[PDB]
Design a protein around this ligand. Structure first.
Ligand SMILES: *[C@@H]1O[C@H](CO)[C@@H](O[C@@H]2O[C@H](CO)[C@@H](O)[C@H](O)[C@H]2NC(C)=O)[C@H](O)[C@H]1NC(C)=O
Lengths: 49, 50, 49, 49
């Protein structure tokens, strides 16, 4: 406890994503609408504009 | 630090707002992706180090 | 012996093909696709990318 | 205005949060400077402010 702030212990957590999005499995929070065909629309399949 | 551990996070729904809020001072400087847009994206595999 | 007429068509088609194929180069950015590079990155660096 | 220490980040372009979303919001195109300081010696009550 008497050590300086420089030598105080720190907890480090490192996250490593894989944005090559081949299977996609850990998709974040959102909500899914229906699918319509043969109409120029804005699609968002798996986070792709 | 020399024997560092890995935990596989898969098949779940992430929520990064909790990490945003409840951690008092947590640096969070990130590489290759904007932190504020981590909610929309989809990830192949997420691994955790400690 | 009608090679002179064929070379013009070959040159034009080949040039158009290489112009189309040139879209694949990343030019040193993260990705060659626009939608992901807007969605995956924070706008201040999106400008230079 | 006066806020707590944790949400001093929320007063900045491009960041979100309860204070940023609801109390004070900066525009995307901003030309100015922000000044903040601790006011624990000045605005803090033993019973509570
Ligand atoms: C780790 O910290 C605590 C467990 O002790 C939890 O966070 C709590 O989350 C609830 C949710 O509403 C809050 O009301 C509490 O104030 C939080 N407590 C603390 C100490 O932050 C949770 O299990 C974990 N949180 C994180 C961010 O890992």
């Amino acid at each position: 406890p008497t050590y300086g702030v420089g030598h105080q212990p720190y907890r480090v957590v490192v996250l490593s994503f894989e944005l090559l999005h081949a299977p996609a499995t850990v998709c974040g929070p959102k909500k899914s609408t229906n699918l319509v065909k043969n109409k120029c629309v804005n699609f968002n399949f798996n986070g792709l504009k | 630090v020399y024997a560092w551990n890995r935990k596989r996070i898969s098949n779940c729904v992430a929520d990064y707002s909790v990490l945003y809020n409840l951690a008092p001072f947590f640096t969070f400087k990130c590489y290759g992706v904007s932190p504020t847009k981590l909610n929309d994206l989809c990830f192949t595999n997420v691994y955790a180090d400690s | 012996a009608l090679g002179k007429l064929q070379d013009v068509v070959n040159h034009n088609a080949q040039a158009l093909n290489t112009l189309v194929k040139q879209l694949s180069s990343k030019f040193g950015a993260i990705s060659s696709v626009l939608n992901d590079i807007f969605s995956r990155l924070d706008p201040p660096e999106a400008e230079v990318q | 205005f006066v806020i707590r220490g944790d949400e001093v980040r929320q007063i900045a372009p491009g960041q979100t949060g309860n204070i940023a979303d609801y109390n004070y919001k900066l525009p995307d195109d901003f030309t100015g400077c922000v000044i903040a300081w601790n006011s624990n010696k000045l605005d803090s009550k033993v019973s509570g402010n």
